[model samples]
Target chain A: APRKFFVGGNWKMNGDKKSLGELIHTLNGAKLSADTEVVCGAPSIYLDFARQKLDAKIGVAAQNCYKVPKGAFTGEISPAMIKDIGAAWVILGHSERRHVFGESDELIGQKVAHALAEGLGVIACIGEKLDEREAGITEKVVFEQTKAIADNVKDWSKVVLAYEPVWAIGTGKVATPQQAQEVHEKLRGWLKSHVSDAVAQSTRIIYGGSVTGGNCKELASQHDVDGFLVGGASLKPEFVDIINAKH
Target chain B: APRKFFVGGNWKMNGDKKSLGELIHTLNGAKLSADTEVVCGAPSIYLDFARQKLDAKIGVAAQNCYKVPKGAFTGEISPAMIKDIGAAWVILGHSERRHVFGESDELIGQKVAHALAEGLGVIACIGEKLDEREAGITEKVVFEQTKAIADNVKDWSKVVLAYEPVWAIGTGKVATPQQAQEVHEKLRGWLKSHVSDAVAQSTRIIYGGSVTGGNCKELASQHDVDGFLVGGASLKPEFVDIINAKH
Candidate 1:
């Protein structure tokens, strides 16, 4: 596997200024790897705040951003604007965006293209919901979401696939390692032939949704799990532990 | 008529660290009123940066915020998080948000309520479109927007009502002195009884849309036009001139 171990802490809509400093200090102070890639997806408003204070070892990202460079779109920050602020990364198409915010796959693909154009590394997320999983369309729905982005994003080197099961996200209900194995089992075989072989082989696919140090090792033990896009656990001291999991 | 002059520089999705400093410098060195209230609504990501560098006289505002305090709303920043950064205000329901982004009266009203509950001042924006202006429904549309907010917000003092006609905002097709006067003239006769005299009289109603030093004086001169919510000109030195329009 060409995938280097990657861990990204998604501080989803969390942190005030003072606490962000504290969080950065904790991450900075934590003994971490020299080889594994790490990134923190801060709130768009706080990406600059986090970037300036975060350890040089870890990267910073905006949780989301608009596809355009600039415009009359009130309340939405643009990728050009976000990049100008110095966040080298952006997380788009998170399930909350797909579910609560009502973003379609087409829209998310456009954002990926836009962010990529601005030279941003995207943690492009896609996953199946509880209903989709129950309906036996878990693999199919994930495939379709990928289909939407593949048409727009030809360059996979800058894109990381984050398979965050919507039902497993935020809720305490994490998909077991066997379940992740199931998706991976079905996906890898289909993926190798589906897109550019170079893309399918080289690009990273990380798991998320209630990903804590306790839950992660078993998850990481699996042959297909590349690393993590940890949620709440990312905010804790144990994030250091999750980062050191591959050891 | 006890309302003092107000001016807000809504930098609306523009500026980086360096340029924002230049903007702050322009404000710092300018000849601003000793008593006039001025607030700068910077991009939300830069709100703290703006607050830290801005002259003490000029208050800081978030361009927009979510109705909730915090949670899994991914890309959204909350009023509570915004206030925690020491910004005193949030601009809600700007025409850019309403028209371009599809924010409804009900949703904007909820955001207004949330911002107020956080003890943040609300620059609640409302205005009619070009069609509404042509159809003679400007006053009716403006009245309805206010009605939605009135149902949600009670304290008129902390709220500044900014009337930015969508047709004129950023189009250089400013509402002439006659149009602003006509809006004010039409608004007053019907509002005194509809919302209550104190609520009607005390709340500040400002103008926006392609406001310049030249156009603002007459807009300011209008009896009902308490001040301005400048867009493009807000970034320039002429902002000082607009701030002192009442002079």
Candidate 2:
């Protein structure tokens, strides 16, 4: 079977109820490709609101989820709660979660393992900091983060790898298609050597960070870049164009 | 003018959409007294949802807010954001935020000042830890925390001080009425000495820490214990009874 193209929009800490209505209305009317799998990860506060307005073709992803199913981890939304609430996909190990919120790779791996056990799809995010990229340790940092989850999950079929270079995220710096392709190609090779050839070829490794409608099609057409995991532009109407970039 | 009975339910890190629905149903149907003001402080995810379900008689409160209005504070909600979403009150300087999240008194005072400046009401929480209580420093600890906020906010009318003894919170160890009353009395006296007699007379010093329907009436009857800052019991059906303690 061919690898399905996956485009996910992470709306981060943006949008109010009125704006969210406009977002879903845009997605509901957009002529997205039938083969492309589109998902919008909104702030958890608007998950139910999104679910009500979203079409079945476009999935809903939680920006983050706790490892435990439920209990006294105050101020955290749990994976089971997300699953129970009809959220099909969850983004784990985002750079913001790792660096800003102090989420360890091992803890993210555990969340991936648990989310999979609960039968929820995973958009497993992996990235390197600007310092790591500057020091030429980008591949090492990305590989280590990815390997943590790859080693734990028995199956990679339900997972989409989002390679978001930390430097580009909300920094107004978009990585060139060549730069993204190089990383995607390397990540594909890493998967083959560390996991399996079938998994490497079938897994959809998407580029994220500062992706916009203007640049998405070029990046999507690259040999190794399967799709996009968008940030800021996702909260805007232009997100629909990014999701349908392959067309 | 008589002080308005201020009752706040701190849902903590508990409740999902379904449970929150049940809670709102109970609160909406309950015959809340006109003389009393009710607010429910929930985990961030539920703030918007709670706002939708809550009746006009009851207000929504965020469990906590970041000192700065907005920026790169991931996983931390901001006062401006909460205010933008129609949350009139925010619980600042809670024991959980202080003990678990390592929020300092100066930081708490800053949050109080910020929240008030943003036009949001402040549930300024202060308390003594077990060691402070054991060492007979409860009055000193409570006074210092309270004074920090008092020093920052020139007008204390918009602030409700929640005196939650850390040792008694969620530990099922309720402080005797005498114990709570003595501290509350001292707090009132300190307010009179430091601020003004009118401020002391008007400020609501609510007791918190494992507060239940069983104990609320007696606590409510205390001369200085104006109302309650309920915790775990707030999520249950008895929360209504606790709200009506003054009735």
Candidate 3:
């Protein structure tokens, strides 16, 4: 099965209505590639605005969601609410969520399961820290991380596995093409051995962490690198260029 | 100086667009007391919709927000975004945020300072756990919590202090009028001593933890209980009754 290219832009906690509205206007008018599927991860405050303004071909995703549909858990949004506003996707377990916010693997797995069960596509993330990489435990770290997300995903079609190395994220450091390909290839092999060959072959495994327009072409050329989860560049005009990188 | 009654509804993580729309319709149509200032703490996803639908007389708030205006904090919304959406207020340091989500006094204080700095009213909450209460340190615990919030507040005018005893919240355990008055009065005295007499006299010190229409009138009659931060009852029509309790 030939995997369609996927590109997700995480706007992070940046952008007010005026700025995001302009970005949406730019994206709505840009010439995008039909071969690539694009989704923008907007802050919860703008998810509805993004969905309402962006063309339907471009999906809108919540940066995160709580595991349950709704409850007394303050300071959280649910997958059900994401669907209520007509946004179809969610980004879960980013390094900020893992380290910065102190979400554990068990919690991320639970969130992945609930988001999937509630019928929202999940761009689940996995990455190793700088120390883990220097210690040469990147494989051990990511595989353990991947296994947590994989165990909860009953269907791979609705999941995009994003490998965002913590050391590279927001540090202006990107994984070299070989580094990304090595991990992607290893991840695919892990999927084949642990889950099934069909999933390994079919799932879209994307790379994140300092991905940008200047370097997207070579990164996209890697056989196993099916797409990207762009950060800062996603909020800029260059995002359009990155979206068309496959061409 | 009379403290005009203030009532806040914390919808927490509940409600979808359909249901919240209905709730807004009910609130918009209901006759609320002229003496009361009403604010609804909608989940972040619905803050925009809530503000847009509810009558202008009624204010809307985000259940929580990150301390900074904006950045790379994935899965978090900022005060700037909340203000951009036209919500006039935010609920910080709710018991659920303190206990369940593990938000610390330092973090909550930072949030209070930032929200106020960004020109949004803050419903800052403080409470002691059951163990702390049983240990006879309820005063010490609550005073400590209050200090953290107070230390960051430059203008007490933009802040509403909510005292939600943890054991009472979501457990249907309503604090007696005497119990509620004791804390509210003590909190005011603490402010008078620690802060200033003007702030103590002018600030609205509200109470939470199983507040309902059935008990609202008696609670409202307390000398220091300025208003309420209703939880589950906030979702029901009885919220109108609670709003009219002062009348």
Candidate 4:
């Protein structure tokens, strides 16, 4: 099965109305590749604004959402709310969410399940830290994380696996194409053995780290690396070039 | 100095476009007390919509926010974004945020500092949990929590201290008026000794924990109970009665 080339821009905890409005304008005007699918992850505060302002072809995603629809969970957004606002997708379990925010894999798994149940596409992220990579247990680390997200996902069509090595995220450290391909390939194999062959064959596995326009083409060239989850460059005009990297 | 009665409706992680729109319409037309200060804490995703729909007389607030202006903190919104969207207030250190989300006192203090720095009003919440209250250390526990928030607050005018007993919040266990007054008075005395006499007298110390229209009048009748941070009842028409409880 062939998967669409997917490129997601995670704006992280950055951007306001003026800057994001400008970035949305650039994205709308740019000649992006028609073959590739693009979704920009905006901070929860701006998900509605981004969805309203961006071109219809370009989708909007909430950076994160809680596992339940509505509750007493203060400071958290629910998948129902995300879907209600006309946003089409959500990015969960990013390295920043795992590390800086202390979110456990179990919680992320629940969130992924709930988001999908609410009929929103999910870009579920998994990754290994620098120490884990240094200890040569990157495979084990990412596999465990993937297991958590995979166990919760009942449908594969709306899920994108984002392999973001904690070491590479916002650290100006880009993983070699071989490194990304190795992890993405193993992830697919894991799905084949643990899940089903159909899911393994169809799921789109993307990479996220210090992805830049200068380096995106090379990363996109990898066999198993289906797309990218861009960070800082996603906020600049360079994001236009990265979105068209598949071309 | 007489502090104006304050009423805050913390909608928590509840309501959507249609439901919230209807609620906002009701609030806009309701005969709210002119002497009371009203602000409703909406989920981050709806802050903009709530601010836009609700009348200018009533303020809007984000349930929580990050301590910084902006960066790579995924899934977290900064106070700058909240202000940029025209929401004038942020509720920090809510019992749910402290217990469910694992936000530390240090982190909540940092959030309070940043929110105030960004020119947003701060409703800093402090309360002892069930066990802590049962242990007869409620005063010590709340004092420590208040210390964390007070250390970050330079200008007292923009800050509201909300004492929401964790056990009573959303649990159908409303504290007696005497119990509420005891804590509010103690909190004010703490401020008089720790902050300043002027701040202690001028700053608002509101009570929260299963606050409803039925119980709001008795709570407001207390000498030190200036207002409330109503939870579940905030989403209903009864919220208008809570707002007028001071009258």
In what order do the candidates fall by lDDT, top score first?
A: 3, 4, 1, 2
Better of 3 and 4 by lDDT: 3
Question: Highest lDDT among the candidates is held by which one?
Answer: 3
- For candidate 1, the lDDT comes to 0.84
- Tell me the docking grade of candidate 2: acceptable
TM-score of only chain B in every candidate structure: 0.96, 0.97, 0.99, 0.98
Runs off by more than 4 Å, candidate 2: A151-155, B67-85, B99-111, B135-155, B189-197
Interface root-mean-square deviation (Å) of every model: 1.4, 2.8, 0.7, 0.7
- Candidate 4 ranges beyond 4 A from true positions: none
Native contact fraction per model: 0.67, 0.21, 0.88, 0.93
| Clash totals in order | 1, 0, 0, 0
Candidate 1 chain A lowest-lDDT run of ten: A183-192
Query: Model 2's lDDT to the true fold?
Result: 0.83
Chain A, model 4: TM = 0.98
Best by DockQ: 4
Candidate 3 chain A lDDT trough over 10 residues, lowest sum:
A66-75
Scored against the true structure, residue A25 in model 3 reaches a CA lDDT of 93
For model 4, residues B132-221, the per-residue Cα lDDT tens digits are 888999999999999999999989989999999999999999999999999999999999999899999999999999998888899999
